[PDB]
Ligand binder design. Structure first.
Ligand SMILES: *[C@@H]1O[C@H](CO)[C@@H](O)[C@H](O)[C@H]1NC(C)=O
Length: 109
């Protein structure tokens, strides 16, 4: 297919933020994937999106901010998880929660 051997047509080129997932051959077209530090945005991978910051998680529709009351301290990986509930643990709140940081509970009251 890169030399004219035509259903085979013209080969896709994977450059920049794209690299080759599957190389082109006589039987099939080349397939792209996103470079490390990036992920496919949409089902066909027409765009790449930068891996998510802390305070976000990777969904099927790209990076999304953690919903209020959840956090993700990891950069480029992990899931938004609920804040520690100090009250259920018999403790009080010493430092409040954020999208990036869990609540810090105090000593046993
Ligand atoms: C902890 O969970 C209890 C039980 O549902 C609830 O009363 C309390 O408001 C919760 N607090 C936080 C900070 O999540």
């Amino acid at each position: 297919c890169p030399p004219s051997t035509f259903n085979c047509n013209i080969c896709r080129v994977c450059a920049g933020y794209f690299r080759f997932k599957k190389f082109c051959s006589s039987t099939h077209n080349a397939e792209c994937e996103c470079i490390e530090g990036f992920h496919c945005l949409g089902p066909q991978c027409t765009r790449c999106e930068k891996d998510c910051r802390p305070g976000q998680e990777l969904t099927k529709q790209g990076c999304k901010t953690c919903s209020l009351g959840t956090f993700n301290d990891q950069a480029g990986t992990g899931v938004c998880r609920p804040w520690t509930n100090c009250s259920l643990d018999g403790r009080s709140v010493l430092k409040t929660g954020t999208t990036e940081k869990d609540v810090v509970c105090g000593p046993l009251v």
